[PDB]
Amino acid sequence: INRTDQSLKNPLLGTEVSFCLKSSSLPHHVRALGQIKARNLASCDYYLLFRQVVLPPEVYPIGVLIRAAEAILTVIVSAWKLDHMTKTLYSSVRYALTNPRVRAQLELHIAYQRIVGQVSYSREADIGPKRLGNMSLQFIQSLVIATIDTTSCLMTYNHFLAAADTAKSRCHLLIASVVQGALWEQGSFLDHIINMIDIIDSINLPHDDYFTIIKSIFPYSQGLVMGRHNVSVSSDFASVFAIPELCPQLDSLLKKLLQLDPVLLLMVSSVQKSWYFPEIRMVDGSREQLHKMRVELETPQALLSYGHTLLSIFRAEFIKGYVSKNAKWPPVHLLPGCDKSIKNARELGRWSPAFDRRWQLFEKVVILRIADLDMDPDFNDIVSDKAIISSRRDWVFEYNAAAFWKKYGERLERPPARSGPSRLVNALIDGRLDNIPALLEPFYRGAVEFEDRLTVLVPKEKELKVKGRFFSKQTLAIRIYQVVAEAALKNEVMPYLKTHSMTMSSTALTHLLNRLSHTITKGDSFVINLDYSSWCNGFRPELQAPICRQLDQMFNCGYFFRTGCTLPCFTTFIIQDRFNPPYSLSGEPVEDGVTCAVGTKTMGEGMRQKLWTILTSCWEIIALREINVTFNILGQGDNQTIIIHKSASQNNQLLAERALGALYKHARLAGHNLKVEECWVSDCLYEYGKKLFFRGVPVPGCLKQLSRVTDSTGELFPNLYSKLACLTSSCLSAAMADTSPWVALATGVCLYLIELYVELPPAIIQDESLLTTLCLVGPSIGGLPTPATLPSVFFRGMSDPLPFQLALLQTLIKTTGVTCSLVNRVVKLRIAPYPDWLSLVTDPTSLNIAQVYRPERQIRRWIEEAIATSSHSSRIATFFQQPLTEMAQLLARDLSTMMPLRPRDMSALFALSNVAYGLSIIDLFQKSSTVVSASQAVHIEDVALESVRYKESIIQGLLDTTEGYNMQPYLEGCTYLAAKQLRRLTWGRDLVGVTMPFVAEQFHPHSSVGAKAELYLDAIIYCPQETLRSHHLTTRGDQPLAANLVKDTLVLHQWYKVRKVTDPHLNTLMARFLLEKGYTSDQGLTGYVNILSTWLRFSSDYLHSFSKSSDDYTIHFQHVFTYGCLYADSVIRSGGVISTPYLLSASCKTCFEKIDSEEFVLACEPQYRGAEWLISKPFDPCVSASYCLGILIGKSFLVDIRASGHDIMEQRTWANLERFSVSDMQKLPWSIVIRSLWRFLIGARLLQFEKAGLIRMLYAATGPTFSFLMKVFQDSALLMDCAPLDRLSPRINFHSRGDLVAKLVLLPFINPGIVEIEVSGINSKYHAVSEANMDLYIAAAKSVGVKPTQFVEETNDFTARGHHHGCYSLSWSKSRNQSQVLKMVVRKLKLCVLYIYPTVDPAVALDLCHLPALTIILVLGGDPAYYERLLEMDLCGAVSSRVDIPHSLAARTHRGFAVGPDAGPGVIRLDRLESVCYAHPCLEELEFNAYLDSELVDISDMCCLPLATPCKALFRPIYRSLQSFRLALMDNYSFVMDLIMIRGLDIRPHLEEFDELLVVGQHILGQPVLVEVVYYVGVVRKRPVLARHPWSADLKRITVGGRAPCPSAARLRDEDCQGSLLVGLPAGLTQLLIID
Amino acid sequence: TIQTAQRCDHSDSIRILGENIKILDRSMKTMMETMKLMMEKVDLLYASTAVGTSAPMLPSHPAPP
Amino acid sequence: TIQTAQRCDHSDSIRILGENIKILDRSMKTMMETMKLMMEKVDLLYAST
Amino acid sequence: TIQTAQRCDHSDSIRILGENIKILDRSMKTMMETMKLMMEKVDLLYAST
Amino acid sequence: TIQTAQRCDHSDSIRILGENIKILDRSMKTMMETMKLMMEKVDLLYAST
Ligand SMILES: [Zn+2]
Ligand SMILES: [Zn+2]
């Protein structure tokens, strides 16, 4: 066949056209030459034609497409229940498809795609004169002849592909831009896009200049943005480019866009691959490439010297990494003359800081063997997407015999038989890769055979470099060498290097980026971007020889690496440019300097991609450290982003200038001339990971990613299904990485409809209802892939696509004029006759349907016969042709016998299987590059016929009206039950484990404007801290955001042994699995909504139904929170403002199913014998869990204390301490955890610094700390049930629950009296419990029992006839009298229901709450902040037991009696009396008068009610018993004495607390209470000193003011009690108590 | 009997032998590095003179064990 | 007596010194082989003279 | 007694130690007559420049 | 018993190898003088190119 491409995937090359125009003898060239008209524009100027193509307006009736898109988007949004947004979307798409320019572009794209589909993969040779408006395209084999009137443009097929791709990209760009403009603060920027398109299309400069402008458009925009918003460091990057001097209109447009909004300019200008691509100038590009490869900017000797310096710095960095990891020096040898400091450091084992600035000392240290080289790469990466050649005897294949004959005058002597097994896969099958080390030996010895000393240079496609960006395609042996070396470096070296480790790690890197995102705005930590334009054609052998020798010595692979640094000096390079072949002399190419080059200095692009990164980091570090500036490096290879932190010595400008100078100097020495035209310094704009952050906020990529047309129909013959799948994957990737889900979804729907329009016939296209149903069907139940039915778009983690699919279909049926019959005839469900368990294990969520539209691949067919031919059998080639599929089927059917069938666990089990590995290897071998291209190339008529066969089959299938399985019963009622029933029917065994419901079905959003009580019964509440508006969508808020098989098998063994099961069959299966491997012995949300989330506070108040019991329900919190944030985002973007808090209520009752905490009992003994050929190489948990929690918390505190204020905003505890529930923790007896933590703390025995840090931050609360402790400690049950606390409760005094917990957890360092009593308990084996298996103990303790109860302790009540016991709640608080007065009024009025507004004092509300036989209804208006505060304050269950939450959240105004308002019906009002004219029997002085609706309430007859066990709100710790007060006072005195010994600790806050107790004691003793007291504190003669009189000059004077007599102390002021207080007290304490 | 044992003990002599062997090993390592420098120089010179001609890549390491 | 015999036996030291001398011999073979190539690297230079 | 007494045998080890020393010294002499090969080759190279 | 002790007696043999160690060590030294000299010879040759 011919024209075997439907998308541009090769670089444009005009050599063939030029050869044809030179009177070539090829028949098809002769035919083509006879059709070009007089004026024949050169192929270079192909865009000059395809820019003049104009179709007549309204050529394609796409109105049905518009209606279908509208209906589809309406249905999707309605299903999501965000109906208020519909209008916007429902209009935007319409507008997008009604603008004349956008419609014209879309019609042009459709015409292009139809033309491509009518010619590509055609049996015919030359296709008739197809018409494209005013063009007259006329294909001839791989040559095209465009013709606008009297102007031919003879070009290659790839040029036409480039034009079609340009049209497609422009259509995508226009549609995406319109949709984005709809959902965007400053919308409708489509006009600027159209103006830009017209301006660029108006350019008339020659090819080279035009493409220079196109290439520079984006860097110039970056320069414009930087030059306008650089606050500290000046930049002149914008001045380098010549856009203003060549395209003034484009410059003016860019300036205008910058004026409007910089982010808009960055977005618009990022579309590079949407303007016609260039025709690489091979003659002037290949010569330049070859010359640049073998140029010498530095003399080799200087290069070698600097290479030695690089070796020194590399050794230093590696040693630092190794010692930091393994706490010891690696095996090293010190040459004579080594500095004594190195000797001592090695002897002890450490990394003295002085080394980092003195790397030169390391020149005398040589690292001995540290590891070994694994000459055995896995197939996964060995055959990755990288074309290769069999061996040197293949170069003749990549050229044209006729062209070779014409150029010289002699034949090519091409071997008629295929001299080599095509690509990697074919050579592998031939059996060459059987023995890897035997193949790599010549590298080890250092003499690679002549057969493997050839490399082909291939121009890179889809790029704007006029002269090309050649990459390397290399023989098999060199490819294996590169793979092995890269793997070894990435595994055994890179992690040790500090610079690359922080980027290899996913979490660490993120932290750094976050820090930068929070610093560049502040005016510090600027960024330097370096762009090595000649990185690959840089490194010379000399620069690599030292580090390469060191590496060879490290891995004991003699000269293995070193050979790579000299190999290019003996290699032959040729340029893959057909119709321009190098001359041959004796079967080898000759050197001409234009097409062939015998030996060059550098291996080539990509080769040794890692070692080069190591060296680059090395010399950048050398450059920076020598000027002593803190820095970080993020290197993507060619380009490097260097973050430079501010230094108080100099401003940012001088620092940046010095850093640039140093980098230039120290990169010149390494033979990398760093021209200052691509390196710039900024503090507002920086790029990493191809994401362009501006002011720390990522720039949206919607325009770029959606306009980046992918390869499409990859690794398969062309077909509708593959195109739709690729489009869906592109849309999902755009949504997941960085894009608005709505923009991606709408653009995906529009593009999907366009794609269907391209292929399908008018019979289906002109049917609106059929088109809608077909687009909504989804792949799950069996249908073409679509971007609509993808719940993974909105949500981040794993998703279940079936319930969402059924919900979409239900909404469609219920809203649109479509009946269930149409859905039936579109879905065409057909249950498979037998269970295919292999599909289930591969895809747990799938059904047993026959996927008719799926394309049946035949790659296995081609290779199955390939292995049969030639009988070669040494490797995977032979011992993987066994009936692997049948064995996998047998294993799957065997796993199917599980009684509570769990597809998730089924897949888990069928993952640690030799058969599973074999199947995965087969899949990778099939679905990869270098195999499909090779397999398709050898056999292509098959795919040519298969494409048309598939197209006809799918058309016929879609056209017929026969209905399938009646899906009516599954399109009504809760979608969760429907999904379960459908799975059970299609499978027949009632899958349990994967049916997590559709969140929108589960939860219905609502606003608190008129919410009823019932809606609040089970709801999740969101509170915005202020009125929300579109501005908030961007400005951040304040609220927080191989060999593995054996280890996996062992981990699963432990996990399944923990779950308390006894399955002999499962143990047998696991033993069989391990037998083969040889072990035969034993919150978070998504990217889109984080910013808006930061302004919202989540919650969990539906505990009234679905969180009180330990049973876990199907709810998925991440998804629920993401959905709620999406609702808020929709309200904002639809022009609304979120002012009041809003809730998500529980809608579908049946969608809340209690999770089945059952265990599988696999019945039949397994029959999966094994795959010997595969894989050549080989006490209760409560106590353990409690000790583990104690030690984990201890180390978390130990790491938190080290962090500074700038390093505490991160919530990442030591090791992910947060992913835990609340009930799970409450299972453990907290006493055990407290004792474990105390033992760890005392055993740790940190010195003053750490102790002071702990004291300060724990009295405060920050980060993964007392913060999360208090989080865990809301439930008052634990407190009174915490054995340490109950004993301690009468020993310490507090003021809030945030202080009692601090005292309890700080007991070890404050009150040794009791901690040394509880320290008795200990067990060595518990200490040995490792944390690597921490989750195992928690899982073992998941179902220990039931958590404790809350109880309800009482407060001092009153009655008409009572006994005055004199006890009163809130004695310390000033509101004491007010609270008591309100209590008396309530009891006098005999109220059963009372309303409390947030205005009332929290303490007063709490005291009112503790009243029995009273219902409290807080007027919260949907904000639980006040109620949460009350719960936190209280230490009993009174609040939780007597506060009606459903009514409180639903009440905006009081209904009946209330407190807090100053006036109104039923309002209780207290008027403070100017003079106390009444002495109440219970209250000595009545300071207030109670009124109710203007009527005074008489409380004279009221009297105290008999008291009983009181709540902690009465401050029992200081009880009537003065001995208790004596205990507390002495304990605090001792604690203060101990604190005084802590150097550098601000003791003042503690001294005020101690002075409070001192005031209480003075009041008890009768001493006067001085308003101000001056205390002198210091350490004299190594002893604490706390005296009011200065007897030592070193004592620090501290003054405490505001001292007042505590009325609570009045009760303790018994005359006989005064003497008992001072008996036995310390002399200093007695002196302090007694006022002179 | 008692005096016949310590004469049969040569712990100090064996320690001296081991220390001397360690000295031999150290000097051997130093030679390894000096020879590696020589090899670097000669290999780089040969490679530099190799480009542009078909000079064979003579081995620069004996063989794997 | 027995404790005296233990001090009289130094197999552990014998083992380490035997291994050390063996690896020394291997290093020597490597020395000879590596040097052997230099003659091929320099003889052509003399011819070029 | 006899079982442990036989373990004290080290004559076989002394044999291989002696042979190792002999062969190592032979390699040393071989390298001596090797280096002596290029000794003059590079010594007269002073007059070469 | 005495004969067994005599059988284990190898001090003389040890003495022999002990002296060889010097012949080793001394020999080792000369190598440097015949390599450092050529090391610098190559170094000043590579620079002059
Ligand atoms: Zn439902
Ligand atoms: Zn309470």
mmCIF file of C-alpha atoms in Angstrom, chain A residues 930-1007:
data_model
loop_
_atom_site.group_PDB
_atom_site.id
_atom_site.type_symbol
_atom_site.label_atom_id
_atom_site.label_comp_id
_atom_site.label_asym_id
_atom_site.label_seq_id
_atom_site.Cartn_x
_atom_site.Cartn_y
_atom_site.Cartn_z
ATOM 1 C CA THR A 930 9.254 -0.375 17.471
ATOM 2 C CA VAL A 931 6.953 -3.429 17.199
ATOM 3 C CA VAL A 932 3.750 -2.162 15.603
ATOM 4 C CA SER A 933 5.759 -0.086 13.135
ATOM 5 C CA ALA A 934 7.985 -3.077 12.400
ATOM 6 C CA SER A 935 5.134 -5.597 12.431
ATOM 7 C CA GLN A 936 2.917 -3.317 10.346
ATOM 8 C CA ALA A 937 5.766 -2.642 7.917
ATOM 9 C CA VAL A 938 6.424 -6.318 7.195
ATOM 10 C CA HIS A 939 2.687 -7.087 6.958
ATOM 11 C CA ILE A 940 0.585 -4.087 5.945
ATOM 12 C CA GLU A 941 -2.060 -5.330 3.491
ATOM 13 C CA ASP A 942 -3.716 -6.972 6.492
ATOM 14 C CA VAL A 943 -4.206 -3.658 8.292
ATOM 15 C CA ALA A 944 -5.143 -1.980 5.012
ATOM 16 C CA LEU A 945 -8.079 -4.356 4.602
ATOM 17 C CA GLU A 946 -8.856 -4.503 8.327
ATOM 18 C CA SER A 947 -9.469 -0.763 8.544
ATOM 19 C CA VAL A 948 -12.225 -0.849 5.928
ATOM 20 C CA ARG A 949 -13.620 -4.093 7.338
ATOM 21 C CA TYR A 950 -13.919 -2.540 10.796
ATOM 22 C CA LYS A 951 -15.443 0.673 9.467
ATOM 23 C CA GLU A 952 -18.110 -1.208 7.536
ATOM 24 C CA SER A 953 -18.837 -3.472 10.499
ATOM 25 C CA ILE A 954 -19.274 -0.594 12.943
ATOM 26 C CA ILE A 955 -21.470 1.349 10.517
ATOM 27 C CA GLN A 956 -23.681 -1.697 10.051
ATOM 28 C CA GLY A 957 -23.849 -2.278 13.795
ATOM 29 C CA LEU A 958 -24.855 1.295 14.563
ATOM 30 C CA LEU A 959 -27.441 1.452 11.781
ATOM 31 C CA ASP A 960 -29.523 -1.610 12.659
ATOM 32 C CA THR A 961 -32.508 -1.027 14.934
ATOM 33 C CA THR A 962 -32.653 -4.386 16.730
ATOM 34 C CA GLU A 963 -32.850 -3.909 20.487
ATOM 35 C CA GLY A 964 -30.608 -5.667 22.982
ATOM 36 C CA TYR A 965 -31.228 -6.659 26.571
ATOM 37 C CA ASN A 966 -34.083 -4.591 27.982
ATOM 38 C CA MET A 967 -32.238 -2.148 30.240
ATOM 39 C CA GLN A 968 -35.422 -0.614 31.661
ATOM 40 C CA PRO A 969 -35.159 -2.029 35.220
ATOM 41 C CA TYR A 970 -31.654 -0.568 35.611
ATOM 42 C CA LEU A 971 -32.713 2.942 34.527
ATOM 43 C CA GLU A 972 -34.854 3.763 37.559
ATOM 44 C CA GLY A 973 -34.288 3.924 41.290
ATOM 45 C CA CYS A 974 -30.997 4.327 43.087
ATOM 46 C CA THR A 975 -28.182 3.902 40.590
ATOM 47 C CA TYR A 976 -26.099 2.059 43.195
ATOM 48 C CA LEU A 977 -28.574 -0.804 43.541
ATOM 49 C CA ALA A 978 -29.031 -0.832 39.773
ATOM 50 C CA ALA A 979 -25.284 -1.169 39.246
ATOM 51 C CA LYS A 980 -25.099 -4.001 41.769
ATOM 52 C CA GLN A 981 -27.975 -5.812 40.072
ATOM 53 C CA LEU A 982 -26.464 -5.353 36.618
ATOM 54 C CA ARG A 983 -23.102 -6.686 37.765
ATOM 55 C CA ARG A 984 -24.782 -9.681 39.385
ATOM 56 C CA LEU A 985 -26.841 -10.425 36.281
ATOM 57 C CA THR A 986 -23.997 -10.145 33.789
ATOM 58 C CA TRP A 987 -21.556 -12.088 35.988
ATOM 59 C CA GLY A 988 -23.940 -14.308 37.943
ATOM 60 C CA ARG A 989 -22.166 -14.250 41.302
ATOM 61 C CA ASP A 990 -23.022 -10.908 42.963
ATOM 62 C CA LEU A 991 -19.763 -8.988 42.966
ATOM 63 C CA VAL A 992 -19.178 -7.333 46.335
ATOM 64 C CA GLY A 993 -16.364 -4.850 46.806
ATOM 65 C CA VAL A 994 -16.570 -2.408 43.876
ATOM 66 C CA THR A 995 -19.814 -0.479 43.676
ATOM 67 C CA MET A 996 -18.975 2.847 45.305
ATOM 68 C CA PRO A 997 -21.962 5.012 44.364
ATOM 69 C CA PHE A 998 -22.366 8.210 42.371
ATOM 70 C CA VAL A 999 -21.658 11.038 44.789
ATOM 71 C CA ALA A 1000 -24.142 13.411 43.161
ATOM 72 C CA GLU A 1001 -26.854 10.781 43.542
ATOM 73 C CA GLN A 1002 -25.746 10.243 47.137
ATOM 74 C CA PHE A 1003 -25.572 13.900 48.197
ATOM 75 C CA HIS A 1004 -27.805 16.767 47.095
ATOM 76 C CA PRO A 1005 -26.435 20.313 47.533
ATOM 77 C CA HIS A 1006 -28.505 22.997 49.225
ATOM 78 C CA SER A 1007 -28.098 26.535 50.518
#
